[PDB]
Protein backbone atom coordinates (compact mmCIF):
# COMPACT_ATOMS: atom_id res chain seq x y z
CA UNK A 1 0.00 0.00 0.00
CA UNK A 2 1.03 3.74 -0.57
CA UNK A 3 0.52 5.60 2.07
CA UNK A 4 0.59 9.36 2.49
CA UNK A 5 0.01 10.19 6.25
CA UNK A 6 -0.33 13.54 7.37
CA UNK A 7 -0.53 15.49 10.54
CA UNK A 8 -3.21 16.09 12.46
CA UNK A 9 -5.55 19.39 13.04
CA UNK A 10 -3.42 22.41 13.60
CA UNK A 11 -5.28 25.45 15.64
CA UNK A 12 -2.84 28.36 15.23
CA UNK A 13 -2.53 32.25 15.67
CA UNK A 14 -3.17 34.66 12.96
CA UNK A 15 0.43 36.03 11.29
CA UNK A 16 2.38 33.75 12.86
CA UNK A 17 3.58 29.90 10.99
CA UNK A 18 2.80 26.58 10.98
CA UNK A 19 4.45 23.33 9.61
CA UNK A 20 2.82 20.40 8.46
CA UNK A 21 3.90 17.00 7.22
CA UNK A 22 3.49 13.91 5.14
CA UNK A 23 5.38 10.63 6.07
CA UNK A 24 5.30 8.27 2.85
CA UNK A 25 5.20 4.86 3.28
CA UNK A 26 4.81 1.56 0.68
CA UNK A 27 7.37 3.21 -1.88
CA UNK A 28 10.90 4.13 -2.38
CA UNK A 29 10.21 8.37 -1.03
CA UNK A 30 12.72 9.64 -3.68
CA UNK A 31 11.72 8.22 -6.32
CA UNK A 32 8.28 10.35 -6.92
CA UNK A 33 7.88 14.40 -6.91
CA UNK A 34 5.65 15.11 -3.60
CA UNK A 35 2.80 18.10 -4.62
CA UNK A 36 1.09 19.93 -2.57
CA UNK A 37 -2.80 21.00 -2.89
CA UNK A 38 -5.25 23.42 -0.78
CA UNK A 39 -9.18 22.48 -0.14
CA UNK A 40 -10.83 25.67 1.30
CA UNK A 41 -14.29 24.43 3.17
CA UNK A 42 -14.86 22.02 1.25
CA UNK A 43 -15.00 23.67 -2.42
CA UNK A 44 -12.02 24.60 -4.49
CA UNK A 45 -9.00 22.66 -4.95
CA UNK A 46 -6.02 25.00 -5.15
CA UNK A 47 -2.52 23.47 -6.63
CA UNK A 48 0.66 24.78 -4.36
CA UNK A 49 3.91 23.32 -5.64
CA UNK A 50 5.85 20.51 -5.52
CA UNK A 51 9.41 18.98 -4.26
CA UNK A 52 11.20 16.32 -5.53
CA UNK A 53 12.75 14.64 -2.42
CA UNK A 54 15.40 12.57 -4.68
CA UNK A 55 17.33 15.52 -5.62
CA UNK A 56 15.43 18.32 -3.78
CA UNK A 57 14.00 20.85 -6.94
CA UNK A 58 10.97 22.34 -6.11
CA UNK A 59 8.24 24.89 -7.80
CA UNK A 60 5.49 26.70 -7.14
CA UNK A 61 2.20 28.61 -8.06
CA UNK A 62 2.68 32.51 -8.27
CA UNK A 63 0.05 32.21 -6.03
CA UNK A 64 1.61 30.85 -3.04
CA UNK A 65 5.16 31.90 -3.46
CA UNK A 66 5.07 34.35 -0.31
CA UNK A 67 2.90 31.97 1.60
CA UNK A 68 4.26 28.34 1.42
CA UNK A 69 7.77 26.56 2.04
CA UNK A 70 7.96 22.94 0.53
CA UNK A 71 10.92 20.95 2.31
CA UNK A 72 11.72 17.03 2.97
CA UNK A 73 13.99 14.57 4.97
CA UNK A 74 14.86 11.99 3.36
CA UNK A 75 15.90 9.95 5.88
CA UNK A 76 12.05 9.54 7.48
CA UNK A 77 10.63 9.77 4.17
CA UNK A 78 8.91 12.93 5.27
CA UNK A 79 7.65 16.01 3.39
CA UNK A 80 6.68 18.73 4.98
CA UNK A 81 5.28 22.30 3.91
CA UNK A 82 5.41 25.29 6.01
CA UNK A 83 2.63 28.43 5.58
CA UNK A 84 3.57 31.91 6.69
CA UNK A 85 1.91 35.25 8.02
CA UNK A 86 -1.25 33.18 8.86
CA UNK A 87 -4.72 34.72 8.09
CA UNK A 88 -8.07 33.45 8.06
CA UNK A 89 -8.01 32.81 4.31
CA UNK A 90 -5.41 29.88 4.91
CA UNK A 91 -7.86 28.07 7.30
CA UNK A 92 -8.68 24.88 4.63
CA UNK A 93 -7.55 21.41 4.61
CA UNK A 94 -3.92 21.17 3.14
CA UNK A 95 -3.23 17.99 1.19
CA UNK A 96 0.48 16.33 -0.02
CA UNK A 97 -0.03 14.47 -3.02
CA UNK A 98 1.97 11.64 -5.00
CA UNK A 99 2.84 12.83 -8.83
CA UNK A 100 2.08 9.00 -10.57
CA UNK A 101 3.44 8.53 -14.50
CA UNK A 102 6.22 8.62 -15.81
CA UNK A 103 6.91 12.36 -16.66
CA UNK A 104 6.41 16.18 -15.37
CA UNK A 105 2.98 15.91 -16.51
CA UNK A 106 2.11 13.32 -14.51
CA UNK A 107 -1.27 12.99 -13.23
CA UNK A 108 -1.44 12.64 -8.77
CA UNK A 109 -2.34 8.64 -8.11
CA UNK A 110 -2.33 9.11 -4.21
CA UNK A 111 -3.80 11.50 -1.86
CA UNK A 112 -2.73 12.43 1.75
CA UNK A 113 -5.07 11.82 4.79
CA UNK A 114 -5.53 15.67 4.76
CA UNK A 115 -4.22 18.50 7.12
CA UNK A 116 -7.07 21.09 8.66
CA UNK A 117 -5.55 24.05 9.67
CA UNK A 118 -7.81 26.54 11.66
CA UNK A 119 -6.49 30.40 12.04
CA UNK A 120 -7.68 31.93 14.96
CA UNK A 121 -7.12 33.55 18.43
CA UNK A 122 -9.77 31.72 20.09
CA UNK A 123 -9.14 29.51 22.90
CA UNK A 124 -9.16 25.67 23.13
CA UNK A 125 -13.00 24.80 24.78
CA UNK A 126 -14.40 21.45 26.03
CA UNK A 127 -17.36 20.88 25.15
CA UNK A 128 -20.99 20.37 27.14
CA UNK A 129 -22.29 17.26 26.36
CA UNK A 130 -26.54 16.54 27.00
CA UNK A 131 -28.19 13.08 26.37
CA UNK A 132 -31.46 13.60 24.78
CA UNK A 133 -33.95 11.19 25.92
CA UNK A 134 -37.81 11.12 24.51
CA UNK A 135 -40.36 13.77 25.52
CA UNK A 136 -44.16 2.93 18.43
CA UNK A 137 -42.05 0.16 16.57
CA UNK A 138 -38.98 2.73 16.66
CA UNK A 139 -37.71 4.89 19.05
CA UNK A 140 -35.14 7.45 18.64
CA UNK A 141 -32.32 9.08 20.92
CA UNK A 142 -29.73 12.04 20.47
CA UNK A 143 -26.80 13.50 22.03
CA UNK A 144 -26.07 17.15 22.18
CA UNK A 145 -22.58 18.11 21.81
CA UNK A 146 -22.02 22.02 22.60
CA UNK A 147 -20.29 25.07 23.32
CA UNK A 148 -16.32 23.42 21.77
CA UNK A 149 -13.27 24.61 20.09
CA UNK A 150 -12.00 24.19 17.33
CA UNK A 151 -13.22 21.09 15.54
CA UNK A 152 -13.21 18.51 15.57
CA UNK A 153 -14.53 16.17 18.00
CA UNK A 154 -15.80 12.04 17.89
CA UNK A 155 -18.99 10.51 18.54
CA UNK A 156 -20.01 7.22 19.04
CA UNK A 157 -22.87 5.23 20.08
CA UNK A 158 -21.98 2.51 22.83
CA UNK A 159 -18.11 3.03 21.99
CA UNK A 160 -19.27 1.94 18.16
CA UNK A 161 -20.91 -1.08 18.38
CA UNK A 162 -24.31 0.85 17.76
CA UNK A 163 -23.25 2.45 14.45
CA UNK A 164 -26.33 1.24 12.59
CA UNK A 165 -29.65 3.68 12.68
CA UNK A 166 -27.21 6.96 13.53
CA UNK A 167 -27.09 10.53 11.95
CA UNK A 168 -24.35 12.40 12.94
CA UNK A 169 -24.67 16.40 11.89
CA UNK A 170 -22.39 18.19 10.87
CA UNK A 171 -20.93 20.69 13.06
CA UNK A 172 -22.17 24.29 13.16
CA UNK A 173 -20.53 27.64 14.34
CA UNK A 174 -22.77 29.43 17.40
CA UNK A 175 -21.27 32.85 19.14
CA UNK A 176 -17.42 31.58 17.76
CA UNK A 177 -18.11 28.30 19.20
CA UNK A 178 -19.17 24.56 17.64
CA UNK A 179 -22.47 22.71 18.40
CA UNK A 180 -22.91 19.30 16.46
CA UNK A 181 -25.81 16.65 17.33
CA UNK A 182 -26.30 12.73 16.63
CA UNK A 183 -29.52 10.69 16.12
CA UNK A 184 -29.84 7.30 17.03
CA UNK A 185 -32.94 5.10 16.00
CA UNK A 186 -33.56 1.59 18.02
CA UNK A 187 -36.07 -0.81 17.80
CA UNK A 188 -38.83 -0.03 21.05
CA UNK A 189 -37.54 -3.45 22.74
CA UNK A 190 -34.33 -2.41 23.02
CA UNK A 191 -34.18 0.69 25.08
CA UNK A 192 -34.20 1.09 28.00
CA UNK A 193 -33.55 -2.12 29.23
CA UNK A 194 -30.49 -2.07 27.30
CA UNK A 195 -28.44 1.12 27.97
CA UNK A 196 -27.32 3.40 25.32
CA UNK A 197 -24.43 6.23 26.11
CA UNK A 198 -23.49 9.21 23.69
CA UNK A 199 -19.29 8.81 23.88
CA UNK A 200 -17.61 12.11 22.71
CA UNK A 201 -13.99 13.04 23.04
CA UNK A 202 -12.78 16.26 21.95
CA UNK A 203 -8.56 15.39 21.87
CA UNK A 204 -7.65 19.56 21.41
CA UNK A 205 -9.12 19.61 25.24
CA UNK A 206 -8.00 16.01 25.91
CA UNK A 207 -11.27 15.55 27.26
CA UNK A 208 -13.58 12.40 27.00
CA UNK A 209 -17.38 12.46 27.95
CA UNK A 210 -19.82 9.18 28.24
CA UNK A 211 -23.45 10.01 28.69
CA UNK A 212 -25.60 8.00 28.84
CA UNK A 213 -29.33 8.60 27.92
CA UNK A 214 -32.09 7.57 30.96
CA UNK A 215 -35.47 8.10 30.08
CA UNK A 216 -37.14 10.65 31.52
CA UNK A 217 -39.40 12.03 34.15
CA UNK B 1 -4.34 30.35 -15.73
CA UNK B 2 -5.56 27.55 -17.34
CA UNK B 3 -9.60 27.64 -16.19
CA UNK B 4 -11.57 24.66 -16.16
CA UNK B 5 -14.83 25.12 -16.21
CA UNK B 6 -17.30 22.28 -15.61
CA UNK B 7 -21.15 21.38 -16.31
CA UNK B 8 -23.22 21.28 -14.67
CA UNK B 9 -22.58 21.95 -10.97
CA UNK B 10 -24.91 19.36 -9.74
CA UNK B 11 -26.40 17.08 -11.13
CA UNK B 12 -28.93 15.16 -10.54
CA UNK B 13 -29.14 11.12 -11.46
CA UNK B 14 -31.84 8.49 -11.19
CA UNK B 15 -30.13 5.06 -9.72
CA UNK B 16 -29.55 2.84 -12.78
CA UNK B 17 -29.32 5.73 -15.35
CA UNK B 18 -26.23 7.37 -17.06
CA UNK B 19 -23.96 10.13 -15.65
CA UNK B 20 -22.18 13.01 -17.77
CA UNK B 21 -20.04 15.94 -16.17
CA UNK B 22 -18.39 17.99 -18.81
CA UNK B 23 -14.90 20.05 -18.04
CA UNK B 24 -14.27 22.29 -20.78
CA UNK B 25 -10.31 24.09 -20.40
CA UNK B 26 -9.82 27.36 -21.62
CA UNK B 27 -6.69 26.27 -24.41
CA UNK B 28 -5.76 22.94 -25.57
CA UNK B 29 -4.32 20.48 -22.11
CA UNK B 30 -2.60 18.38 -25.01
CA UNK B 31 0.88 17.16 -25.86
CA UNK B 32 2.58 14.79 -28.20
CA UNK B 33 -1.03 14.20 -28.72
CA UNK B 34 -2.08 13.46 -25.02
CA UNK B 35 -4.42 14.74 -23.48
CA UNK B 36 -3.16 16.04 -20.08
CA UNK B 37 -6.38 15.65 -17.82
CA UNK B 38 -7.31 14.00 -15.19
CA UNK B 39 -10.47 13.13 -12.36
CA UNK B 40 -11.18 12.63 -9.35
CA UNK B 41 -13.35 11.41 -7.00
CA UNK B 42 -14.07 13.37 -3.62
CA UNK B 43 -16.48 11.67 -0.84
CA UNK B 44 -17.85 14.36 2.11
CA UNK B 45 -14.57 14.41 4.35
CA UNK B 46 -12.55 12.18 2.41
CA UNK B 47 -9.11 13.07 0.42
CA UNK B 48 -9.66 12.51 -3.37
CA UNK B 49 -9.05 9.58 -5.37
CA UNK B 50 -8.04 9.01 -8.75
CA UNK B 51 -10.31 7.92 -11.39
CA UNK B 52 -9.70 8.58 -15.06
CA UNK B 53 -6.01 9.70 -15.87
CA UNK B 54 -4.91 11.40 -19.43
CA UNK B 55 -8.43 11.81 -20.55
CA UNK B 56 -9.38 8.19 -20.34
CA UNK B 57 -7.26 5.10 -18.68
CA UNK B 58 -9.07 3.86 -16.02
CA UNK B 59 -7.40 3.70 -12.78
CA UNK B 60 -6.03 0.16 -11.49
CA UNK B 61 -9.40 -0.63 -8.73
CA UNK B 62 -11.96 1.92 -9.71
CA UNK B 63 -15.03 -0.05 -11.27
CA UNK B 64 -15.48 -0.05 -15.19
CA UNK B 65 -18.24 1.75 -14.32
CA UNK B 66 -16.56 4.97 -14.83
CA UNK B 67 -15.08 6.12 -18.20
CA UNK B 68 -13.86 9.69 -19.72
CA UNK B 69 -13.38 10.92 -23.29
CA UNK B 70 -12.11 13.91 -25.20
CA UNK B 71 -9.26 15.94 -26.19
CA UNK B 72 -7.90 19.26 -26.68
CA UNK B 73 -9.87 21.48 -24.43
CA UNK B 74 -13.83 18.84 -24.06
CA UNK B 75 -13.94 16.65 -21.84
CA UNK B 76 -16.38 14.63 -20.00
CA UNK B 77 -16.69 11.54 -17.84
CA UNK B 78 -19.77 8.99 -17.90
CA UNK B 79 -21.01 6.74 -15.02
CA UNK B 80 -23.34 4.16 -16.03
CA UNK B 81 -24.92 2.64 -14.05
CA UNK B 82 -24.93 5.21 -11.63
CA UNK B 83 -25.00 3.70 -8.09
CA UNK B 84 -25.99 4.81 -4.62
CA UNK B 85 -22.66 5.29 -3.07
CA UNK B 86 -21.17 7.01 -6.58
CA UNK B 87 -22.79 10.60 -4.42
CA UNK B 88 -19.76 12.82 -4.21
CA UNK B 89 -17.92 15.42 -5.94
CA UNK B 90 -16.32 14.86 -8.85
CA UNK B 91 -13.42 17.35 -10.42
CA UNK B 92 -11.49 17.58 -13.09
CA UNK B 93 -7.85 18.69 -13.49
CA UNK B 94 -4.92 19.43 -15.96
CA UNK B 95 -1.29 18.89 -16.12
CA UNK B 96 -0.46 19.91 -19.15
CA UNK B 97 1.36 23.09 -17.87
CA UNK B 98 2.32 24.58 -14.64
CA UNK B 99 0.17 26.10 -12.75
CA UNK B 100 -1.95 22.88 -12.34
CA UNK B 101 -6.08 23.48 -12.55
CA UNK B 102 -9.02 22.21 -11.36
CA UNK B 103 -12.28 22.39 -12.01
CA UNK B 104 -14.58 23.82 -9.49
CA UNK B 105 -16.51 20.51 -9.52
CA UNK B 106 -19.62 18.44 -9.99
CA UNK B 107 -21.81 17.11 -6.98
CA UNK B 108 -23.52 14.38 -7.96
CA UNK B 109 -26.92 13.99 -6.19
CA UNK B 110 -29.15 10.40 -6.99
CA UNK B 111 -33.10 11.41 -7.63
CA UNK B 112 -35.02 9.36 -6.26
CA UNK B 113 -38.89 9.12 -4.76
CA UNK B 114 -40.18 11.70 -2.41
CA UNK B 115 -40.24 10.85 1.49
CA UNK B 116 -41.66 11.98 4.03
CA UNK B 117 -39.55 12.69 7.32
CA UNK B 118 -39.46 11.04 10.90
CA UNK B 119 -39.55 13.54 13.14
CA UNK B 120 -38.44 13.36 16.69
CA UNK B 121 -38.55 16.75 19.42
CA UNK B 122 -36.41 17.11 22.36
CA UNK B 123 -36.88 19.48 25.19
CA UNK B 124 -33.59 20.66 26.97
CA UNK B 125 -31.78 18.31 28.85
CA UNK B 126 -32.09 19.00 32.82
CA UNK B 127 -27.76 19.10 32.76
CA UNK B 128 -27.86 21.83 30.33
CA UNK B 129 -31.04 23.83 32.04
CA UNK B 130 -28.73 23.63 35.55
CA UNK B 131 -25.85 25.88 33.29
CA UNK B 132 -28.50 29.15 32.42
CA UNK B 133 -29.21 27.62 28.48
CA UNK B 134 -32.20 25.84 26.83
CA UNK B 135 -31.93 24.34 23.61
CA UNK B 136 -34.63 22.31 21.80
CA UNK B 137 -33.71 19.81 19.08
CA UNK B 138 -35.93 18.74 16.35
CA UNK B 139 -34.88 15.54 14.09
CA UNK B 140 -35.91 15.03 10.69
CA UNK B 141 -34.62 12.13 9.94
CA UNK B 142 -34.54 10.06 5.91
CA UNK B 143 -36.43 12.05 3.98
CA UNK B 144 -36.31 13.39 0.23
CA UNK B 145 -35.88 16.00 -1.20
CA UNK B 146 -33.33 17.93 0.79
CA UNK B 147 -35.14 21.56 0.17
CA UNK B 148 -37.29 21.20 3.35
CA UNK B 149 -39.04 24.29 5.39
CA UNK B 150 -38.88 23.75 9.39
CA UNK B 151 -40.48 25.85 11.50
CA UNK B 152 -40.99 26.38 15.03
CA UNK B 153 -43.64 28.22 17.37
CA UNK B 154 -43.66 28.74 20.75
CA UNK B 155 -47.02 29.25 22.37
CA UNK B 156 -48.21 28.36 18.31
CA UNK B 157 -46.15 31.35 17.48
CA UNK B 158 -43.58 31.38 14.98
CA UNK B 159 -39.97 31.89 16.14
CA UNK B 160 -36.48 33.16 14.16
CA UNK B 161 -33.61 33.47 15.32
CA UNK B 162 -31.66 31.84 17.69
CA UNK B 163 -32.52 28.98 15.16
CA UNK B 164 -29.61 27.09 13.61
CA UNK B 165 -29.99 24.01 10.97
CA UNK B 166 -27.72 21.00 10.14
CA UNK B 167 -28.08 18.81 7.24
CA UNK B 168 -26.38 15.45 6.14
CA UNK B 169 -25.13 14.94 3.13
CA UNK B 170 -27.06 12.50 0.61
CA UNK B 171 -26.61 8.76 2.30
CA UNK B 172 -24.77 6.27 0.45
CA UNK B 173 -27.03 3.78 0.55
CA UNK B 174 -31.29 4.81 1.04
CA UNK B 175 -30.38 8.09 -1.45
CA UNK B 176 -32.23 10.12 1.59
CA UNK B 177 -31.28 13.42 3.56
CA UNK B 178 -31.42 14.15 7.67
CA UNK B 179 -31.22 17.54 9.33
CA UNK B 180 -31.73 19.04 13.04
CA UNK B 181 -32.90 22.33 13.87
CA UNK B 182 -31.94 23.63 17.32
CA UNK B 183 -33.92 26.38 18.86
CA UNK B 184 -31.29 27.82 21.43
CA UNK B 185 -33.57 30.30 24.04
CA UNK B 186 -32.08 31.38 27.41
CA UNK B 187 -33.33 29.13 30.39
CA UNK B 188 -35.13 32.54 31.33
CA UNK B 189 -37.20 32.88 28.18
CA UNK B 190 -37.65 29.20 27.79
CA UNK B 191 -39.61 28.94 30.83
CA UNK B 192 -41.94 31.48 30.29
CA UNK B 193 -43.69 29.87 27.77
CA UNK B 194 -45.25 25.94 27.82
CA UNK B 195 -46.09 25.32 24.29
CA UNK B 196 -42.67 24.01 21.82
CA UNK B 197 -43.32 22.69 17.93
CA UNK B 198 -41.02 21.89 15.42
CA UNK B 199 -42.89 21.91 11.83
CA UNK B 200 -41.62 20.09 8.49
CA UNK B 201 -43.29 20.83 5.00
CA UNK B 202 -49.73 19.67 5.08
CA UNK B 203 -46.20 19.98 7.78
CA UNK B 204 -45.42 16.68 9.54
CA UNK B 205 -45.44 18.08 13.38
CA UNK B 206 -43.90 17.39 16.62
CA UNK B 207 -44.58 19.10 20.46
CA UNK B 208 -44.49 19.13 24.28
CA UNK B 209 -45.22 20.56 26.98
CA UNK B 210 -42.90 22.38 29.22
CA UNK B 211 -44.99 20.95 32.27
CA UNK B 212 -46.18 17.71 30.88
C1 LIG C 1 3.51 10.71 -27.81
O1 LIG C 1 4.08 10.85 -26.51
C2 LIG C 1 3.54 10.21 -25.40
C3 LIG C 1 2.79 9.01 -25.48
C4 LIG C 1 2.31 8.39 -24.30
S1 LIG C 1 1.45 6.99 -24.47
O2 LIG C 1 1.90 5.83 -23.70
O3 LIG C 1 0.03 7.29 -24.07
O4 LIG C 1 1.34 6.65 -25.90
C5 LIG C 1 2.52 9.06 -23.06
C6 LIG C 1 2.02 8.52 -21.84
C7 LIG C 1 2.27 9.15 -20.63
C8 LIG C 1 3.03 10.34 -20.52
C9 LIG C 1 3.25 10.96 -19.29
S2 LIG C 1 2.67 10.33 -17.83
O5 LIG C 1 3.22 8.97 -17.67
O6 LIG C 1 3.20 11.17 -16.78
O7 LIG C 1 1.24 10.25 -17.91
C10 LIG C 1 4.02 12.18 -19.30
C11 LIG C 1 4.55 12.79 -20.48
S3 LIG C 1 5.42 14.17 -20.30
O8 LIG C 1 4.86 15.26 -21.14
O9 LIG C 1 6.84 13.86 -20.52
O10 LIG C 1 5.43 14.68 -18.90
C12 LIG C 1 4.31 12.12 -21.72
C13 LIG C 1 4.76 12.66 -22.96
C14 LIG C 1 4.50 12.00 -24.14
C15 LIG C 1 3.77 10.81 -24.17
C16 LIG C 1 3.26 10.25 -22.99
C17 LIG C 1 3.53 10.92 -21.75
ZN1 LIG D 1 -5.12 32.11 -17.81
ZN1 LIG E 1 -0.70 26.67 -23.10
ZN1 LIG F 1 -30.56 7.79 7.38
ZN1 LIG G 1 -41.05 35.07 25.54
ZN1 LIG H 1 -46.05 32.12 26.06
ZN1 LIG I 1 -49.25 12.87 28.67
Known amino acids: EVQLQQSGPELVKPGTSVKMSCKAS????????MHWVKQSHGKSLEWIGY????????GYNQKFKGKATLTVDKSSSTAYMELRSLTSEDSAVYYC??????????????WGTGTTVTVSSAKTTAPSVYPLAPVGSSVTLGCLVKGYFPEPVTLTWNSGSLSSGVHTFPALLQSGLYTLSSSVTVTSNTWPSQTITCNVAHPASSTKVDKKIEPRG | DIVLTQSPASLAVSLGQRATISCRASESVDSYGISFMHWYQQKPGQPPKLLIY???NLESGIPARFSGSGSRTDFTLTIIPVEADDVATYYCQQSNEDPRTFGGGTKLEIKRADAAPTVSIFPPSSEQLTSGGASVVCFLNNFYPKDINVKWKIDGSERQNGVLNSWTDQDSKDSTYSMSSTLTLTKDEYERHNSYTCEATSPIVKSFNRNE
Open chain 2, 54 to 56: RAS
Open chain 1, 26 to 33: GYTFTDYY
Open chain 1, 97 to 110: ARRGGYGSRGYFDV
Open chain 1, 51 to 58: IYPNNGGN
